Ligand binder design. Structure first.
Ligand SMILES: [Mg+2]
Ligand SMILES: [Mg+2]
Ligand SMILES: [Mg+2]
Ligand SMILES: [Mg+2]
Ligand SMILES: [Mg+2]
Ligand SMILES: [Mg+2]
Ligand SMILES: [Mg+2]
Ligand SMILES: [Mg+2]
Ligand SMILES: [Mg+2]
Ligand SMILES: [Mg+2]
Ligand SMILES: [Mg+2]
Ligand SMILES: [Mg+2]
Ligand SMILES: [Mg+2]
Ligand SMILES: [Mg+2]
Ligand SMILES: [Mg+2]
Ligand SMILES: [Mg+2]
Ligand SMILES: [Mg+2]
Ligand SMILES: [Mg+2]
Ligand SMILES: [Mg+2]
Ligand SMILES: [Mg+2]
Ligand SMILES: [Mg+2]
Ligand SMILES: [Mg+2]
Ligand SMILES: [Mg+2]
Ligand SMILES: [Mg+2]
Ligand SMILES: [Mg+2]
Ligand SMILES: [Mg+2]
Ligand SMILES: [Mg+2]
Ligand SMILES: [Mg+2]
Ligand SMILES: [Mg+2]
Ligand SMILES: [Mg+2]
Ligand SMILES: [Mg+2]
Ligand SMILES: [Mg+2]
Ligand SMILES: [Mg+2]
Ligand SMILES: [Mg+2]
Ligand SMILES: [Mg+2]
Ligand SMILES: [Mg+2]
Ligand SMILES: [Mg+2]
Ligand SMILES: [Mg+2]
Ligand SMILES: [Mg+2]
Ligand SMILES: [Mg+2]
Ligand SMILES: [Mg+2]
Ligand SMILES: [Mg+2]
Ligand SMILES: [Mg+2]
Ligand SMILES: [Mg+2]
Ligand SMILES: [Mg+2]
Ligand SMILES: [Mg+2]
Ligand SMILES: [Mg+2]
Ligand SMILES: [Mg+2]
Ligand SMILES: [Mg+2]
Ligand SMILES: [Mg+2]
Ligand SMILES: [Mg+2]
Ligand SMILES: [Mg+2]
Ligand SMILES: [Mg+2]
Ligand SMILES: [Mg+2]
Ligand SMILES: [Mg+2]
Ligand SMILES: [Mg+2]
Lengths: 159, 208, 171, 296, 23
RNA sequence: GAGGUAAAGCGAAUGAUUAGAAGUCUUGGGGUUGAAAUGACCUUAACUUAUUCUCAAACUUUAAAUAUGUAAGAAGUCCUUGUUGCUUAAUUGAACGUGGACAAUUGAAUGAAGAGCUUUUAGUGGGCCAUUUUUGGUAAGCAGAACUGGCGAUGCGGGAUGA
RNA sequence: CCUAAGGGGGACUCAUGGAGAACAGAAAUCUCCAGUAGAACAAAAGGGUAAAAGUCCCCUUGAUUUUGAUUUUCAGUGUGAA
RNA sequence: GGUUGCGGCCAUAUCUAGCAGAAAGCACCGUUCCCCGUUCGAUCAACCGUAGUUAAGCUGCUAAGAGCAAUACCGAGUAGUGUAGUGGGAGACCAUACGCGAAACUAUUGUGCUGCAAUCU
């Protein structure tokens, strides 16, 4: 007999963290979600209402609706050869703001601050990010660091 | 009754132990893992000799029992029953299955026997004895090697008996009062925890 | 200071138990005896499970017990110690500083005998404690009692011997 | 021979509760239900009337909760009452009523809703809720937070409730926990509630005890005796206190006999400070050597 | 009148462990 | 961000599991110390304590690799103040806006016979093989799954010969 | 299968161990301490739950009405369930 | 800086055993007419702040403490793994190449930080 229920295979996914069971810290209920916010989805096993399906555990999406205790999040799911827009109603216990927005949002501020400062100084500044480049030339001092010669060691048994 | 061991040599299946899910499992043929003078103190038998597997393989409980009996008999016959402490270091916890005891429909087998799954470098048998009984104990294990399939090496341990310390570090910890007897084994001093209990347990502790 | 006023030992409560093995009229008369002795309506205890050997069944009203505090507890305790002629054993004191004894006839206490009532034996247990036990019993900020403030066997034994001029045996 | 229970694995796998739950001070279930706000009202806060009783004081605070911690809006203490004319019985039910009225009036002064939402100016003990004014801002809405204290008809927390309701704040409530509620005949006897508002029970105890035990009256009611305050003029003590509370509900802090730095320096002289690593290492060496005398 | 209330939860007990004879 | 497989762990929970040592007033028994004591002794067996050997697809604190969700701007960021019957104690917010500022390094790489969209219809709906992961089975040129690449549908050079 | 074993609120805290109390003993009832859940939650198993979701008490019928939106299986059809 | 009320993070805060704690606070503490709840004013309810106490709570310090937390020329570039070969080996399995890379172990350090309001030698 095959089994394919709603929470099948979620034995460990929906578990609470070790030594983290019980009551929900109240910063979860004090956070404010606005339409357009990017949120990570992580089902809390101790709250069974407004709980996401196991597919959305670990997914990140956009808030589109705000209700009394829940937010609506838009997820794009692959169905065959295309994406289908999914609209999941989730209580805020299974939701947390995504930490990706802010890095962008700080880099936007830093670029704006750097551009005006170069504009203030009448010079130019380059704002595009760069991948790590190969390192330049360098000189290695040997005062106190004369090279030590190593050799491969013979085989030994230690039991 | 019992198939040839060649049918069960390799670790082809996941571990299938006794549990709440398989209950009608027979007992392993090997029940005794410590032989000889198992109550001897650590200082009596400094020399340790291992039989080590050079194979990722399964060894039946029948083979374990046979090799244990062979080694024990030979060593007690040649050097006496109180000249060694033999320990079998692998326990057969994996259940083999047999199907016929139609065809392939509903072919999930019944428990048939027990085997230990050994890796490369895993110790199968350990023998702590005196140095003068080396050639005897070695010859005791080399015969036991014949009861096993695959390749095994007889390796003389660098350590004192069944302890994790080398034969020089044990003497250092012994003259420093940093080890005490515990019957067949020993306890080592810890520099952590209740100071008073540690000091009481090791009166001969030359503190520095 | 070990000689502090608030470290004074004194009785917390006295619990009177009559475990009549059956339900019905006999248990009712034991409850009448307890309500007579204490002046308070007692409470009946139900069997937690069924034992055929003891002739009891689950949720059958078996025993009756009552808790008394204050001067009435002191009066009942000395009335019961008179029956024991002020001589307990060392084994009668628990490691937590509580003690108990058991009388065999309730007319020995000094109450009127009724043929309809009959005689019942009775069980006495005294819970000892110093001041400040409310910490462990209040709702908010419940905590534990410090080691020196705890009640133990020796302090209770010495306090009983001093306050009653009695003897604590140990046979 | 039983197994020792308190093993190292027991401590290793132990999950400690929230810090303020292990102190036994916060019921986080009730706190979650009180504080949590409708997510579609976003940053509009819920306001709590925190009511706490100590052995000597009544604390009433208007609080809104945030991630960095709770923030006090206003606060009225029972020890503020002597400024208003109540010097004794700072934990009466009537002292609770006075504290509730004071915190309500002080909050309304801070907001600016003084002339609007005066409240129940003629306290007759009738059940009443602060009704909104047409074509105007709604009354300041506050929900009661009694903490761990049990809900009983006659409890002192609902005295602060009635005071806050009478002070002009809108606090939703029912009258079946007030003193004077007949549970059999489900109506409120407003006469007994008004009696409780103006210290009627204490004055009646004074009168009933005085003619039955003068020595106990002398010990229990000392402060009244050296002030020559009888039962019949208790009511005036509250009626005036009420008036004064409505005249100037603003908070006046106690003038401090020392400055913050002087207080800190004085307190810093006591309380032992942790030993350096070297000191305890020397202690360990001494204890090892001093253990050598019991080698037998 | 009044009676003791079930503080426990062993609804389908009707017996108890550890209660072994010959012990 | 999510995950709970590999590995690892068991003097960490659960479950399995070898050996001694020291202890205890329910020790589980045998003998004698005994008038008997249940109060010692010799013993085995129980537990307790600190250790010891070995394990788990349906155990687990920890915890990969590979693989996976989202973001990397002009539909962006910031400033001011318009609309509502929603919301706030409110002149608070919510959403949608007027007006203004930030100009090509307009905010990573690489590529892009360009991107996007629609209608309509064929054949097919027996599959099989190789590496790796993997299940049943003693195994099978056996049966069954995962990912990819192939044969089928495909000739050419090699493997003599061979999907 | 359940008028509660549904809903709300309140109070309390289980499994088990130790030490004690007449009959009473391995198992009756009473007391204290310890007790991270080692219990209980209708029924398989997993997850979840401790001033509770467990035990007890009080009041109830939200197991109600009108229909939309959404999640799973999915053709993004039905049904069931949420 | 201490203390209280309300908190955020939720053990660097827990657990065990000792010792100390000025001021205020908190607390234990005293009583039962009243609202209220109990077998029991023990809990809960109310009254007094009057008769007493830091004994306990609470707070701080101590411990080659348990636990927890952090760090690393610790173990270990080990186990494992992505990718590769007409590599080795009868096989089981193993080596090498380009990459990623643990857990246990060992050692050291630390043992709540902090927001709003009020108050204090
Ligand atoms: Mg089946
Ligand atoms: Mg299945
Ligand atoms: Mg998880
Ligand atoms: Mg539901
Ligand atoms: Mg859902
Ligand atoms: Mg530029
Ligand atoms: Mg297989
Ligand atoms: Mg055999
Ligand atoms: Mg061989
Ligand atoms: Mg009977
Ligand atoms: Mg915690
Ligand atoms: Mg509540
Ligand atoms: Mg039950
Ligand atoms: Mg594994
Ligand atoms: Mg493994
Ligand atoms: Mg591990
Ligand atoms: Mg004998
Ligand atoms: Mg404006
Ligand atoms: Mg514009
Ligand atoms: Mg980049
Ligand atoms: Mg077509
Ligand atoms: Mg088509
Ligand atoms: Mg077609
Ligand atoms: Mg067709
Ligand atoms: Mg075919
Ligand atoms: Mg066909
Ligand atoms: Mg291929
Ligand atoms: Mg290959
Ligand atoms: Mg096939
Ligand atoms: Mg074809
Ligand atoms: Mg081709
Ligand atoms: Mg060709
Ligand atoms: Mg060819
Ligand atoms: Mg060929
Ligand atoms: Mg239910
Ligand atoms: Mg219900
Ligand atoms: Mg309910
Ligand atoms: Mg409840
Ligand atoms: Mg229905
Ligand atoms: Mg279907
Ligand atoms: Mg559907
Ligand atoms: Mg569909
Ligand atoms: Mg559908
Ligand atoms: Mg449907
Ligand atoms: Mg400082
Ligand atoms: Mg003081
Ligand atoms: Mg009282
Ligand atoms: Mg009270
Ligand atoms: Mg103190
Ligand atoms: Mg003190
Ligand atoms: Mg430590
Ligand atoms: Mg430490
Ligand atoms: Mg590899
Ligand atoms: Mg390959
Ligand atoms: Mg070649
Ligand atoms: Mg490599």
């Amino acid at each position: 007999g095959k089994s394919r229920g709603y929470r099948s295979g979620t034995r460990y996914a929906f578990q609470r963290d070790f030594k983290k069971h019980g009551a929900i810290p109240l910063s979860t209920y004090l956070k404010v979600y606005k339409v357009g916010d990017i949120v990570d989805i992580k089902a809390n096993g101790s709250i069974q209402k407004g709980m996401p399906h196991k597919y959305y555990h670990g997914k990140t999406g956009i808030v589109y609706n705000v209700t009394k205790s829940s937010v609506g999040v838009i997820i794009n799911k692959v169905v065959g050869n295309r994406y289908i827009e999914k609209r999941v109603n989730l209580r805020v216990e299974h939701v947390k703001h995504s930490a990706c927005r802010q890095e962008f949002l700080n880099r936007v501020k830093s670029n704006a601050a750097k551009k005006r400062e170069a504009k203030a100084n009448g010079e130019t500044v380059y704002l595009k990010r760069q991948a790590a480049k190969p390192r330049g030339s360098r000189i290695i001092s040997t005062e106190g660091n004369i090279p030590q010669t190593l050799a491969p060691v013979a085989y030994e048994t230690f039991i | 009754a019992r198939r040839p061991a060649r049918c069960y040599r390799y670790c082809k299946n996941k571990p299938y132990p006794k549990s709440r899910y398989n209950r009608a499992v027979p007992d392993a043929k090997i029940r005794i893992y410590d032989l000889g003078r198992k109550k001897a103190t650590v200082d009596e038998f400094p020399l340790c000799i291992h039989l080590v597997s050079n194979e990722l393989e399964q060894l039946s409980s029948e083979a374990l029992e046979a090799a244990r009996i062979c080694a024990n008999k030979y060593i007690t016959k040649v050097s006496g029953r109180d000249s060694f402490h033999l320990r079998v270091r692998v326990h057969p916890f994996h259940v083999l299955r047999i199907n016929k005891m139609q065809g392939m429909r509903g072919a999930w087998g019944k428990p048939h026997g027990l085997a230990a799954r050994v890796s490369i470098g895993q110790i199968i048998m350990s023998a702590r004895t005196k140095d003068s009984n080396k050639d005897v104990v070695i010859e005791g294990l080399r015969r036991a090697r014949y009861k096993f399939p695959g390749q095994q090496k007889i390796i003389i341990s660098k350590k004192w008996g069944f302890t994790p310390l080398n034969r020089d570090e044990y003497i250092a910890k012994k003259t420093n009062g940093e080890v005490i007897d515990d019957g067949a084994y020993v306890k080592f001093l810890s520099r952590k925890g209740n100071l008073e209990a540690n000091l009481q347990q090791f009166p001969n502790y030359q503190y520095s | 200071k070990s000689q502090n006023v608030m470290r004074e030992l004194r009785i917390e409560k006295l619990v009177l138990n009559i475990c009549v093995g059956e339900s019905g009229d006999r248990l009712t008369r034991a409850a009448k005896v307890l309500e007579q002795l204490s002046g308070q309506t007692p409470v009946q205890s139900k069997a937690r499970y069924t034992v055929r050997t003891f002739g009891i069944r689950r949720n059958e009203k078996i025993a009756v017990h009552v808790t008394v505090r204050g001067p009435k507890a002191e009066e009942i305790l000395e009335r019961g110690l008179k029956v024991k002629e002020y001589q307990l054993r060392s084994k009668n004191f628990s490691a937590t500083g509580n003690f108990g004894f058991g009388i065999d006839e309730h007319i020995d206490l000094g109450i009127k005998y009724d043929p309809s009532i009959g005689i019942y034996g009775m069980d006495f247990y005294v819970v000892m404690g110093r001041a400040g036990a409310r910490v462990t019993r209040r709702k908010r900020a419940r905590s534990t009692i410090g080691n020196s403030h705890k009640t133990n066997k020796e302090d209770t034994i010495q306090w009983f011997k001093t306050r009653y001029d009695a003897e604590v045996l140990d046979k | 021979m039983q197994k020792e229970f308190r093993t190292s694995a027991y401590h290793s796998r132990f999950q400690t509760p929230f810090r303020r739950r292990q102190e036994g001070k916060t019921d986080y279930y009730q706190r979650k239900r009180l504080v949590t706000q409708h997510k579609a009202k976003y940053n509009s806060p819920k306001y709590r009337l925190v009511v706490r009783f100590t052995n000597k004081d009544i604390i009433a605070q208007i609080v809104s909760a945030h991630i960095t911690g709770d923030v006090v809006f206003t606060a009225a203490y029972a020890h503020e009452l002597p400024r208003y004319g109540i010097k004794y019985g700072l934990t009466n039910w009537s002292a609770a009523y006075a504290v509730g009225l004071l915190v309500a009036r002080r909050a309304l002064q801070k907001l600016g809703l003084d002339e609007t939402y005066t409240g129940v100016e003629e306290v007759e003990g009738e059940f009443e809720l602060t009704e909104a004014v047409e074509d105007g801002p709604r009354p300041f809405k506050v929900f009661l937070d009694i903490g761990l204290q049990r809900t009983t008809t006659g409890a002192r927390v609902f005295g602060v409730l009635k005071g806050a309701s009478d002070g002009g704040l809108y606090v939703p409530h029912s009258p079946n926990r007030f003193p004077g509620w007949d549970i059999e005949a489900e109506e409120l006897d407003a006469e007994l509630l008004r009696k409780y508002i103006f210290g009627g029970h204490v004055a009646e105890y004074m009168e009933e005890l005085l003619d039955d035990d003068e020595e106990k009256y002398k010990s229990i009611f000392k402060n009244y005796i050296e002030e020559e305050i009888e039962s019949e003029d208790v009511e005036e003590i509250y009626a005036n206190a009420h008036e004064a509370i409505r005249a100037d509900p603003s908070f006046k802090p106690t003038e401090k006999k020392f400055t913050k730095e002087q207080y800190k320096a004085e307190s810093k002289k006591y309380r032992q400070q942790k030993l350096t690593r070297a000191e305890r290492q020397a202690k360990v060496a001494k204890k090892i050597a001093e253990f050598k005398a019991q080698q037998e | 009148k009044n009676t003791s209330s079930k503080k426990s939860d062993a609804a389908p007990a009707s017996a108890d462990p550890a209660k072994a004879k010959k012990k």
